[PDB]
């Protein structure tokens, strides 16, 4: 079950991440990709309060993706992001493309 | 027309419910399922300010679903929820599954 | 690539519009329709702070759509909206219908 998850609001990241954990626990063999854009990109910073949760999702083989446009608008450096994070040119472009590829969309 | 509606933010429930009413009025013979998770689950409490609206949606044959994970994290009891409410193990799992079954997704 | 974009929160319109610009720049020959409903409808007012951005999207051949139900609940007049704006009876009905027609959904 392929699911492309979107997270855009930084203030809702904690709840969004718990929801992703819920998804993982509920759908057997789920193939999950989480795309963070807009202000939510800040959650991928090395000193992020949700770093341990993000690292746990990575351990669970979940693909964590950050939006380049968002990284740039938030004045962040790739050097400052959690290691092992994939980046796409556009978070919204990725979300749309994955859906066209058959991935089920979930907005958090 | 099968539509699976998601509502996750408690502070936006009033507007979300009005939007569902709008959907109902706009799409003839719509088959609607509303899944509430995260903080929005509180709207399904018996003393909820939106109870009368929820009851009206039920009257209109709309399926109202509450997330068990969310009920648990909000420390709520099934005894405290509006009668006639269906519950799923995971709100996000339900949203994803209905979409895979052909239901059109609407995030409110 | 057909994409139906939803924007419902007025306080998030600036970021949503930038995200639409990002979509446009990222997906070659994207066919985009943006549906604004709930409080976001206010962004289509003639004296709107985002008017110039909306006009730019229109220039880029992006279809800008406003929800009639939302226009009514916000006590707005069609005379007060940006010229060239299309209106639908229900923003949510449009979002659902476009998806059933094969348009990819993006919630902003």
The string of DSSP codes covering B52-65 is HHHHHHHHTTPEEE
Is residue A106 less than 8 Å (CB to CB) from chain C?
no
The count of C-alpha atoms lying within 13 angstroms of the C-alpha of C96, restricted to the half-sphere facing its C-beta, is: 29
Distances (CA, A) of B83 to B32, B59, B86, B95, C100: 18, 13, 9, 22, 33
- The helix/strand/coil state of A66 is strand
Counted across chains A and B, CB pairs separated by less than 8 A come out at: 45
Q: List B residues 74-93 in contact with A (Cβ-Cβ < 8 A).
A: 89-93
Q: Determine the length of chain A.
A: 108
Cα-Cα-Cα-Cα torsion A9, B34, B21, C83, nearest 10 degrees, comes to 40
* Angle at alpha carbon of residue A36, lines to C108 and B93, rounded to 5°: 80
Burial of C77 (0-12, 13-18, 19+ CB in 10 A): exposed
Residue A71 has which token pair? 């990284």
Distance CA C71, CA B2 (A): 26
CB contact under 8 A, C96 and B15: no
Distance (Å) from the C-alpha of residue B65 to the closest C-alpha of chain A? Answer: 16
Distance CA A91, CA A36 (A): 7
Distance CA B65, CA C75 (A): 32
Best of A32, A102, A106 to mutate (most B CBs within 10 Å, chain B) = A106
Is residue B96 less than 8 Å (CB to CB) from chain A?
yes
Q: Residue written as tokens 């859906």?
A: A99
Distance CA A70, CA A91 (A): 8
Q: Tell me if B105 sits within 8 A of C99, measured CB to CB.
A: yes
Q: Residue written as tokens 């899944």?
A: B35
In chain A, the residue whose alpha carbon lies closest to the alpha carbon of B70 is A19
Cα-Cα end-to-end distance for chain C:
18
CB contact under 8 A, B106 and C90: no
Cα-Cα-Cα-Cα torsion B31, B7, C4, C51, nearest 10 degrees, comes to 130
Q: List C residues 16-55 in contact with A (Cβ-Cβ < 8 A).
A: 18-20, 22-23, 25-27
Domains of chain C: 1-108 (3.40.1260.10)
Cα-Cα end-to-end distance for chain A:
18
Question: Contacts of residue C106 in chain A, CB cutoff 8 Å?
Answer: 92, 95-96
Q: Tell me if A32 sits within 8 A of A20, measured CB to CB.
A: yes
Distance CA C26, CA C28 (A): 6
CB contact under 8 A, A22 and B90: yes
Question: Contacts of residue A105 in chain C, CB cutoff 8 Å?
Answer: 105
Q: Is A49 left (phi over 0), alpha (psi -120 to 50) or beta?
A: alpha
Distances (CA, A) of C11 to A5, A24, C5, C48, C49: 22, 31, 16, 12, 12
Question: Contacts of residue A39 in chain C, CB cutoff 8 Å?
Answer: 15
Distance CA B33, CA A16 (A): 21
Is residue C69 less than 8 Å (CB to CB) from chain B?
yes
Question: Contacts of residue C27 in chain A, CB cutoff 8 Å?
Answer: 90, 93, 96-97
Residue C103 has which token pair? 């348009």
Question: Contacts of residue C97 in chain B, CB cutoff 8 Å?
Answer: 27
């Amino acid at each position: 079950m392929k699911v492309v998850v979107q997270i855009k609001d930084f203030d809702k990241v904690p709840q969004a991440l718990r929801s992703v954990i819920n998804l993982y626990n509920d759908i057997k063999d789920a193939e999950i990709e989480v795309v963070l854009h807009q202000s939510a990109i800040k959650a991928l910073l090395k000193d992020s309060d949700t770093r341990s949760i993000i690292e746990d999702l990575i351990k669970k083989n979940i693909l964590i993706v950050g939006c380049e446009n968002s990284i740039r608008s938030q004045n962040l450096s790739h050097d400052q992001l959690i290691p092992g994070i994939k980046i796409v040119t556009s978070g919204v472009g990725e979300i749309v493309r994955k859906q066209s590829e058959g991935w089920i969309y979930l907005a958090l």
